[PDB]
């Protein structure tokens, strides 16, 4: 018949975080790239000397690329080096930046 409680009883113990700065946003932007039909490793090896890479997106349109670094210090060091001496690749001068838009790189939207 009736009961003062559900058949689903209590179990486990709660462990949920309130608030933490677990990570910061870090994606390198590359523009004015060469056009020679190269493998993705050719672009990735521009960022490999400065730190570890998580994710990337190449764009043939206007010859651009995006690269997610493991750390924001590893990313900012690539920008600082380019500001001191400009990056050259396959005989083209590369526009090196760090994106305010891109916190990380993911295929498709974050929604379901």
UniProtKB/Swiss-Prot annotation:
Q: Which sequence positions carry the modification called N6-acetyllysine?
A: 52, 101
List where in the cell it is found: Nucleus matrix
Q: Which residues form a coiled coil?
A: none
Q: Which domain of life is it from?
A: Eukaryota
Domain RRM residues, every copy: 26-101
Q: Glycyl lysine isopeptide (Lys-Gly) (interchain with G-Cter in SUMO2) cross-link position in this chain? A: 8, 17, 21, 45, 52, 84-85
Residue list for modification Phosphoserine: 39, 41, 63
- How is the quaternary structure described? Part of a complex consisting of SFPQ, NONO and MATR3. Interacts with AGO1 and AGO2. Part of a complex composed at least of ASH2L, EMSY, HCFC1, HSPA8, CCAR2, MATR3, MKI67, RBBP5, TUBB2A, WDR5 and ZNF335; this complex may have a histone H3-specific methyltransferase activity. Interacts with TARDBP. Part of the HDP-RNP complex composed of at least HEXIM1, PRKDC, XRCC5, XRCC6, paraspeckle proteins (SFPQ, NONO, PSPC1, RBM14, and MATR3) and NEAT1 RNA. Interacts with FUS. Interacts with IGF2BP1. Interacts with IGF2BP2 and IGF2BP3. Interacts with RBPMS.
Q: What does this protein do?
A: May play a role in transcription or may interact with other nuclear matrix proteins to form the internal fibrogranular network. In association with the SFPQ-NONO heteromer may play a role in nuclear retention of defective RNAs. Plays a role in the regulation of DNA virus-mediated innate immune response by assembling into the HDP-RNP complex, a complex that serves as a platform for IRF3 phosphorylation and subsequent innate immune response activation through the cGAS-STING pathway.
Tell me the protein's name.
Matrin-3
Species, as recorded: Mus musculus (Mouse)
Per the record, the gene is Matr3
**Residue span relative to the full protein:** 478 to 576 of 846
């Amino acid at each position: 018949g009736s009961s003062g409680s559900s058949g689903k009883k209590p179990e486990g113990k709660p462990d949920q975080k309130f608030d933490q700065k677990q990570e910061l946003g870090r994606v390198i932007h590359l523009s004015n790239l060469p056009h020679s039909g190269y493998s993705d490793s050719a672009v990735l090896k521009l960022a490999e000397p400065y730190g570890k890479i998580k994710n990337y997106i190449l764009m043939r349109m206007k010859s651009q690329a995006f690269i997610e670094m493991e750390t924001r210090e590893d990313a900012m060091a690539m920008v600082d080096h380019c500001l001191k001496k400009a990056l050259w690749f396959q005989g083209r001068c590369v526009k090196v930046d760090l994106s305010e838009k891109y916190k990380k790189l993911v295929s498709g939207p974050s929604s379901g």
